[PDB]
C-alpha cells in the first residue's frame, strides 16, 4: 500500500508532487541546461574539463619523467644500425631540449632500444600535445578547433637511413618537400615535410659532422578533447608496447627512482593508471553527444490546455533522463580520473613516482608545454595543480550535482508512470 510508503520515505512523496507539476519539471530542465553549460562550456569551473586536462597532462608528464633515460636507435626498418645518430628536437633529454637516439648494433625491440619508427610515433603525439597544452585546451563542446604544430629531427652518421626518401616521402633529400593529407576525425590534416642537408664544413656548424634535417609542419590538427586524448593514448601505448630499456641518473640528495635500470613497461602500476585515466576521460567526453542530442530547452506542460497528466503527457522524460544520467556519469568519471592519480590514496613506489617526479617541475611556473634543459626527470605538466583545480571545481558543483540528481529522479518517475 502507498500511504504506508510515503510515511517511511518522506522525500518520495515530495518527488511525486514535483513530477506532476509542470513548473517544477521545467525548473529542473532549466537546471539541466545550466549544469550542461558548466560541464561542456566552461574550463576552469568544469570538473569534466579538468579531468580531461589531467589525463592528458599525466601522459605527457610520464614521458617528461622518463624519456631522457630511454634508449633508442637503429635504422628505418626497425633494424639495427652500425653508426646512426638521430636527434629529435623539443624533447626532454638529459640537460638538453633534444633526445638523441644513438644506440647501435643492438636490435630495437623489447628491453632494447626504441626503434626510430616508434620514436617518430611517440614524438609526433608528444609535439602535438605540448603544442595544444601550450595554447590552452578548448571547452569540451568545441570540436572544430585546430592547431599548427612544427617539429624537427636530424640524422647523421654513416649509413643512417632515418631521413631518406623511403623514411620521409620526399623525392630530393636536399631542399626537397612533400605534402600529404590524411584525415584525423572527419577533419583534413595537411602535413608538409621538408628536408635540408648541412655539410660538416658548412659555417655555423657546432657538431663537427654533417647531417640531414627533417621539418614537419602539420596544419589543421584537431585540438578537441576526443582528438587530444587519442594522442595521449598513442603516446602511452607506444611506450608501453615498445617497452624499451631505460636507465636513470640518480641525482645527489634528490628524490630516488626505483628501479634504476629496467624496461619502461616495468612501471606497470603507473602505466595502468594513466591508461585508465585516458579511458575514463574518453568515456566522459562521449557523454557530450548524449547531452547535445537531448536539449532540455523546450518547455513542457499539458496539451489542449487541460491539466498535465504524468501518465500520458510525458514522452520528453526518456530524453531528460538520458541527459541527466549523462551529466551525472560525466561528473563521476571526472572524479574517478582524479582518484586514479591523486597521491592521497596512492601507496608504495607508485606514490613515490607521483609525489617525487610526475607532480614536479624542474624548469625555472613556465607556461604549459615548454621543454627546457631542466625538464627531464620531472613531469612539468601541472599535475598537482590540475588535481587541486579538479577538486575545487567539484566542490563548486555542489548545487548542480543535486539538481541533476533531482532532474534524473523526476524523469525516472515519469518514465515509470508512462507504462
Amino acid at each position, epitope marked *: 500500500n502507498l500511504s504506508k510508503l510515503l510515511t517511511r520515505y518522506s*522525500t518520495l512523496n*515530495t*518527488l511525486i508532487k*514535483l513530477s506532476a507539476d509542470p513548473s517544477a519539471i521545467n525548473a529542473a530542465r532549466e537546471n539541466l541546461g545550466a549544469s550542461a553549460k558548466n560541464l561542456i562550456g566552461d574550463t576552469k569551473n568544469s570538473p569534466a574539463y579538468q579531468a580531461v586536462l589531467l589525463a592528458i597532462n599525466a601522459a605527457v608528464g610520464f614521458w617528461n619523467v622518463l624519456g631522457y633515460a630511454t634508449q633508442c636507435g637503429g635504422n628505418a626498418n626497425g633494424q639495427e644500425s652500425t653508426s646512426s645518430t638521430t636527434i629529435f628536437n623539443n624533447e626532454p633529454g638529459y640537460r638538453s631540449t633534444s633526445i638523441t637516439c644513438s644506440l647501435n648494433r643492438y636490435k630495437p625491440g623489447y628491453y632494447g632500444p626504441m626503434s626510430i619508427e616508434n620514436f617518430k610515433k611517440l614524438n609526433e603525439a608528444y609535439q602535438i600535445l605540448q603544442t595544444a597544452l601550450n595554447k590552452g585546451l578548448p571547452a569540451l563542446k568545441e570540436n572544430n578547433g585546430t592547431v599548427s604544430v612544427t617539429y624537427t629531427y636530424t640524422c647523421s652518421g654513416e649509413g643512417n637511413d632515418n631521413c631518406s626518401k623511403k623514411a620521409t616521402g620526399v623525392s630530393d633529400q636536399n631542399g626537397g618537400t612533400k605534402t600529404k593529407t590524411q584525415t584525423i576525425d572527419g577533419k583534413t590534416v595537411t602535413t608538409t615535410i621538408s628536408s635540408k642537408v648541412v655539410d660538416s664544413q658548412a659555417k655555423g656548424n657546432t657538431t663537427r659532422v654533417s647531417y640531414t634535417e627533417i621539418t614537419n609542419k602539420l596544419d589543421g590538427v584537431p585540438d578537441s578533447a576526443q582528438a587530444l586524448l587519442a594522442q595521449a593514448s598513442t603516446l602511452i601505448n607506444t611506450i608501453n608496447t615498445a617497452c624499451p630499456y631505460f636507465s636513470v641518473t640518480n641525482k645527489s640528495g634528490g628524490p630516488q627512482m626505483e628501479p634504476t635500470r629496467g624496461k619502461l613497461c616495468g612501471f606497470t602500476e603507473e602505466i595502468s593508471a594513466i591508461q585508465k585515466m585516458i579511458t575514463d576521460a574518453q568515456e566522459l567526453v562521449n557523454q557530450t553527444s548524449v547531452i547535445n542530442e537531448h536539449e532540455q530547452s523546450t518547455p513542457v506542460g499539458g496539451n489542449n490546455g487541460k491539466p498535465f497528466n504524468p501518465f500520458t503527457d510525458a514522452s520528453f522524460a526518456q530524453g531528460m533522463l538520458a541527459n541527466a544520467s549523462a551529466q*551525472a556519469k560525466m*561528473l*563521476n568519471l571526472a*572524479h574517478q580520473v582524479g*582518484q586514479t592519480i*591523486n*597521491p*592521497d*590514496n596512492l601507496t608504495g613506489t607508485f606514490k613515490n613516482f607521483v609525489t617525487g617526479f610526475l607532480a614536479t617541475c624542474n624548469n625555472k611556473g613556465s607556461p604549459p608545454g615548454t621543454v627546457t634543459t631542466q625538464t627531464f626527470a620531472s613531469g612539468c605538466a601541472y599535475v598537482e595543480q590540475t588535481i*587541486t583545480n579538479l*577538486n*575545487n571545481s*567539484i*566542490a*563548486h*558543483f*555542489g*548545487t548542480q*550535482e*543535486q539538481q541533476i*540528481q*533531482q532532474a534524473e529522479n523526476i524523469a525516472d518517475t515519469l518514465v515509470n508512470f508512462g507504462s
Partner: nanobody, 113 residues
C-alpha cells in the same frame, strides 16, 4: 562505506550547533566532502563543501553563518552553525562530492522558540 552524523538537536533562534560526521577512509581520503540538508516538504539541498586542502565554500542561504571544517587525521567533518533561524530546521547529512550513493541516517536540527 559509512557515514555517521551527530550533534543535532532542538535550539532557539540565535543558537549554535556543531554537527559532526565520522566518515570512513574510503569516502573521506583525498575527497571533497560536504554537508547537505533536507527540510520538511523539500528535496535534499546542498549546504557546504570543503576540499582536501581545507578550502571551504557555501550555499548562499548559509554563507556567513555556517563554517565547514575537516580533520584529515581522524576522517572527521564538522559544520559549525551560527545565528540559526527557523528556516535552518532540517535533517543534515554529510557525504563526499560527488556523492557516495548510500547516505547516512542524518542528524535532526530544529530551530524554534
Amino acid at each position: 562505506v559509512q557515514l555517521q552524523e551527530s550533534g543535532g538537536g532542538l535550539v532557539q533562534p540565535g543558537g549554535s550547533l556543531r554537527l559532526s560526521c565520522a566518515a570512513s577512509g574510503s569516502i573521506f581520503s583525498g575527497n571533497v566532502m560536504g554537508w547537505y540538508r533536507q527540510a520538511p516538504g523539500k528535496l535534499r539541498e546542498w549546504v557546504a563543501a570543503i576540499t582536501p586542502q581545507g578550502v571551504p565554500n557555501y550555499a548562499d542561504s548559509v554563507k556567513g553563518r555556517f563554517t565547514i571544517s575537516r580533520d584529515n587525521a581522524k576522517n572527521m567533518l564538522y559544520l559549525q552553525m551560527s545565528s540559526l533561524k527557523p528556516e535552518d530546521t532540517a535533517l543534515y547529512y554529510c557525504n563526499r562530492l560527488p556523492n557516495y550513493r548510500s547516505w547516512g541516517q542524518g542528524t535532526q536540527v530544529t530551530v524554534s522558540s
